Design a protein around this ligand. Structure first.
Ligand code: COH
Ligand code: COH
Ligand SMILES: *[C@@H]1O[C@H](CO)[C@@H](O[C@@H]2O[C@H](CO)[C@@H](O[C@H]3O[C@H](CO)[C@@H](O)[C@H](O)[C@@H]3O)[C@H](O)[C@H]2NC(C)=O)[C@H](O)[C@H]1NC(C)=O
Ligand SMILES: *[C@@H]1O[C@H](CO)[C@@H](O[C@@H]2O[C@H](CO)[C@@H](O[C@H]3O[C@H](CO)[C@@H](O)[C@H](O)[C@@H]3O)[C@H](O)[C@H]2NC(C)=O)[C@H](O)[C@H]1NC(C)=O
Ligand SMILES: CS(=O)(=O)c1ccc(C2=C(c3ccccc3)C(=O)OC2)cc1
Ligand SMILES: CS(=O)(=O)c1ccc(C2=C(c3ccccc3)C(=O)OC2)cc1
Ligand SMILES: *[C@@H]1O[C@H](CO)[C@@H](O)[C@H](O)[C@H]1NC(C)=O
Ligand SMILES: *[C@@H]1O[C@H](CO)[C@@H](O)[C@H](O)[C@H]1NC(C)=O
Ligand SMILES: [N+]
Ligand SMILES: [N+]
Lengths: 551, 551
């Protein structure tokens, strides 16, 4: 298969012609030639005028006094934010194309919603090396890579100050569209909404939704424990959950996502978001005393979806970015632009989002340290301390640095190995190939990748060629941007996936984005003034301070 | 419910505020005021410069010599065709909004692909009259409407000269996205692909597809009978079909759509499209002797999807329009525009497509006549005359006129009645309510609606108020345009659905629409040269002349 060497550059589509020849389709790539590497004239100019992503990142993270002005000049802030959205989202094909089973466009790959889609097609099955033509005939031992490049010896804190409120928000949030179906394999998902539908609160299916609902006032079922509201149980709802056998029945809280019984941190946000839904229900009932349970529930869900995107853009990502420019959630920025209001979750999006280095060695709640064995599946901890205590504690506890390597906790070691194994199982192309896919210069050496000599020597001993290095391992050991949590590649591959998935939501389309969709101005206002702090303020006893960084 | 009166105009969203108050959301309607009825300044200009549709239709169906010049100026033909697509598609909300159970925006309505969507929301439940406020407490008798207004008394031929080739094409073509799930109700569909995915050839599910495929050279199973290719049997494939018990085993042909055994006219196109598929497999095997079965199959399917859309626009719809202007299938026309590559079939789209007056009183094949008694479920006729004779006979047989009322054959009388009942059951708004939804002046008198005296008289007896007339009845009794097949409403409501459905397909998106997607330039050329004539010519013995109009 001549396409094994990935001959086609700049998004050129490779296709075999006979047994010994290929043909690059350069249509609308900006280039021409056998391999789509000769630039057209406007491409030459653009490339010449295009500053490096790291130059852009410098400018965005410096000159604070300059961005102060920009931030308070609506026309400017809007124009910039609008550009940020369109430029980044352009790197994601929409509607989607390839998946794990198709390196060529096909109706099965487009239409079958059970697959994660793919940004780059899989490596053909009959290739000399598992990645194409580079590297040894066999790939390095996954456990070896994990042990020599990923495993944590000494905890490395996030220089950006990310706390456990951020870490668990990331886990909780992404697991509504990262829902791998291992019954079928790593290439499949149970998140058929492929985005922010809040199925992790309300359930994936109507059947599960109906189990969780109270069908009174539009609300969700709940328990009252020590004066405060918590989710209902498996027993009361009949909504199944993943709990080991030791968990007593009355401690098996039922929420949208089956897996959120895993850690108390997830069950916290489950509790907080459950509280938020029922709160919005009270609000809406006042606005619409003539409304029944159904419209109250449905409108509340739409409001909470908006809240989610609002918070994720203006608190979650703003924190990650480290920008002085204030990011903005505003569907109006795109109403004059070409933009697809749909999304399909990429398998690589899932892979790069395995930020398990965030995890600490122990969890500190109030005056007590819990190890992993103590902390996993322990809902008594949640009741023992209550949500307020949790917020206050997690806000103070630092999270780990993702990029830079050697910062994955031993407890979640095998998970990190699984992340590698499943990449290979789904035939991922190389790190350098994904770099090129998102308009990044490929790394020419290991030393250039890590910015150091120790891990780069291990990499060289493992892989041989820099073009054989795999996506997930490279992402975690990539040289961090100055005092950053991520390296360049995590950002330039991540931001497009994130922003597309957020703005490519139905509620952001002009037909939906108007006050009547959310039951008037009052409801519409809940979205547009939402924040991580006010979410905690309105739903956590005492209204404690919180943010995604430690004070 | 105060919104029963449908107070909000010009796409304004009506919303209850309290028990006896309402509020219109005039967001981006171009209007303001309590009822969104006062035009904004730019709207004033647009409103006064827009020519009536009948003016536009006159201009498009006259000045023949001028259009033949326009047609041969790529710059002009493109510009025109582009505006046609964008303008007509701006009338369809995308992503979709309402369905039969939700007259307000909700996540259940958007996300649930089992519903038909709705261009207008369902009339609320507790309203004064079924339509809202207008009309009597009870709608007139269904059968009585059918008999006094819709039932044929003497066959009325289509002025534009449409034939059975056209009639069965419409039935065959539209039955891939009109698959009402009557096991659940008229509001639900089985075509979850919601558009032109050719499931009526390949089967809706992978399970069914696998039964129909040969898994050799990407081809579909088939028989050779009398030296010609026919679809395989239920026996040979295990693919269930709707056949009555009388039908012998060997005449139980199995194709994608379970119901196409219903008439020989449908099985005709099934056979032709089946031959086209395996023909393209042959063409692609010569271009790619290295390709395997799976890719040969998938790529052929993508090609046939291209062929269908090509023919529907440039042959099928071009015929229907009677436009001197030569419509063009060219996805590149929209790469500059705001356009959403996605679709959701509207129940109203389904309703208005019940062109059952197209049907003759008898079916003439060669030198024989068959009535509905002996024509239905009789594939023996198909094998008796062969496909070639079928095309020769259908090409020459005139179809009935759809507008003007009183042209439904007694055989499908019940069906016509089923249309009205299922409409009421789904809480459709009035005919005049839909005219306003598609920017038409509502008819003020029954006479203006029918342009005659006897039927309008009959209508005023049944309904009383012109605002009480239902969608389906009016569409078929409406005054046709000059020597036209339809009235203006059918067109100005039909076209937006048609074009959105066609151009919203994935393959029209810029990532798919390139030669590599279709196997190269040869494969790509098959799409861009397709016509109803060449489909017949390539897959039917003797290459008989054919067309959607009688000689
Ligand atoms: C982004 C934040 C984030 C955090 C904070 C987080 C924190 C935690 C944590 C303790 C707090 C524990 C015990 C786990 C344990 C796991 N993680 Co996460 N993980 C997170 C993102 C991921 C993602 C992404 C996946 C892939 C999920 C999937 O469905 O494939 C993952 C998968 C898992 C799996 C499934 C293993 C597999 O083979 O797929 C386990 C077990 N987990 N993780
Ligand atoms: C546009 C062309 C067209 C033609 C030529 C056509 C010609 C014929 C014909 C003889 C030639 C017969 C016996 C039928 C008989 C039927 N038609 Co059509 N119909 C057509 C468009 C429709 C559409 C559209 C529907 C709605 C189908 C759905 O799935 O909801 C329809 C539904 C039906 C149903 C559904 C049954 C029910 O809802 O109770 C029957 C029976 N049929 N029709
Ligand atoms: C999306 O693609 C999925 C994977 O290709 C597909 O799942 C596959 O479905 C087939 C047929 O339904 C299964 O085949 C099995 O089915 C019966 C079981 O009784 C047997 O007769 C077969 O021989 C075979 O055992 C596959 O097992 C299944 N594969 C996986 C990984 O789940 C989905 O159906 C596709 N989605 C849609 C909507 O079509
Ligand atoms: C899309 O909307 C459909 C209409 O609401 C919905 O179909 C409905 O699905 C539920 C299952 O959640 C069915 O429930 C029936 O069966 C259970 C079995 O225990 C009973 O408890 C229920 O009382 C009820 O009898 C509904 O009957 C069914 N309705 C129809 C008209 O088919 C789909 O499930 C929705 N799709 C998705 C993906 O959620
Ligand atoms: C580590 S950094 O260089 O400070 C940095 C961090 C985040 C971003 C940004 C992301 C992003 C979000 C999720 C994953 C990856 C990136 C985004 O959508 O906008 C900016 C940009 C830069
Ligand atoms: C009856 S007529 O006035 O000659 C006429 C016929 C067809 C059209 C046209 C339709 C159409 C197709 C199916 C249903 C309804 C409209 C279209 O998509 O473009 C033109 C426009 C006008
Ligand atoms: C769960 O937490 C409680 C404290 O609230 C503790 O007593 C118990 O030991 C924990 N469970 C395990 C298995 O350590
Ligand atoms: C079916 O057609 C054949 C001729 O092709 C005819 O002899 C037969 O009677 C028809 N069936 C019915 C039920 O009329
Ligand atoms: N650093
Ligand atoms: N006429």
């Amino acid at each position: 298969n001549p396409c094994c060497s990935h001959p086609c550059q700049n998004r050129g589509v490779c296709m075999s012609v006979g047994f010994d020849q290929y043909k690059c389709d350069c249509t609308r790539t900006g280039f021409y030639g056998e391999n789509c590497s000769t630039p057209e004239f406007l491409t030459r100019i653009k490339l010449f005028l295009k500053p490096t992503p790291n130059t852009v990142h410098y400018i965005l993270t410096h000159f604070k006094g300059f961005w102060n002005v920009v931030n308070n000049i609506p026309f400017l802030r809007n124009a910039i934010m609008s550009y940020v959205l369109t430029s980044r989202s352009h790197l994601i094909d929409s509607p989607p194309t390839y998946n794990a089973d198709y390196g060529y466009k096909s109706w099965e790959a487009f239409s079958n919603l059970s697959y994660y889609t793919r940004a780059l097609p899989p490596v053909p099955d009959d290739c000399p090396t598992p990645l194409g033509v580079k590297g040894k005939k066999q790939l390095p031992d996954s456990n070896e890579i994990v042990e020599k490049l990923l495993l944590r010896r000494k905890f490395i804190p996030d220089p950006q100050g990310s706390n456990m409120m951020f870490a668990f928000f990331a886990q909780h949030f992404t697991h509504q569209f990262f829902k791998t179906d291992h019954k079928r394999g790593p290439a499949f998902t149970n998140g058929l909404g492929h985005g922010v539908d809040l199925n992790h609160i309300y359930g994936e299916t109507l059947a599960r939704q109906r189990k969780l609902r109270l069908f009174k006032d539009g609300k969700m079922k709940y328990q009252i424990i020590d004066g405060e509201m918590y989710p209902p149980t498996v027993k009361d709802t009949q909504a199944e959950m993943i709990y080991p056998p030791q968990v007593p029945e009355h401690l098996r809280f039922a929420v949208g996502q089956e897996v959120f019984g895993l850690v108390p941190g997830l069950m916290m946000y489950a509790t907080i978001w459950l509280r938020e839904h029922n709160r919005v229900c009270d609000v809406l009932k006042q606005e619409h005393p003539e409304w029944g349970d159904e419209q109250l529930f449905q409108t509340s869900r739409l409001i909470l979806i908006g809240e989610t995107i609002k918070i994720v853009i203006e608190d979650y990502v703003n924190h990650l970015s480290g920008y002085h420019f204030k990011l903005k959630f505003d569907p109006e920025l795109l109403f004059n632009k070409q933009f697809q209001y749909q999304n399909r979750i990429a398998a690589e999006f899932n892979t790069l989002y395995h930020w398990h280095p965030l995890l600490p060695d122990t969890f500190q709640i109030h005056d007590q340290k819990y190890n992993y064995q103590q902390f996993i599946y322990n809902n008594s901890i949640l009741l023992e301390h209550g949500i307020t205590q949790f917020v206050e504690s997690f806000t103070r506890q630092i999270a780990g640095r993702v990029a830079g390597g050697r910062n994955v906790p031993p407890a979640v070691q095998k998970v990190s190995q699984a992340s590698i194994d499943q990449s290979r199982q789904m035939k991922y192309q190389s790190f350098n190939e994904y770099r090129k896919r998102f308009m990044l210069k490929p790394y020419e050496s290991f030393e250039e990748l890590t910015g150091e000599k120790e891990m780069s020597a291990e990499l060289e001993a493992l892989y041989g060629d820099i073009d054989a290095v795999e996506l997930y391992p490279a992402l975690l050991v990539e040289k961090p941007r100055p005092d950053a949590i991520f390296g360049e590649t995590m950002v330039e591959v991540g931001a497009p996936f994130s922003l597309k998935g957020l703005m490519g939501n139905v509620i952001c389309s002009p037909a939906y984005w108007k006050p009547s969709t959310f039951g008037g101005e009052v409801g519409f206002q809940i979205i547009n003034t939402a924040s991580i702090q006010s979410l905690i303020c309105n739903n956590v006893k005492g209204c404690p301070f919180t943010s995604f960084s430690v004070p």
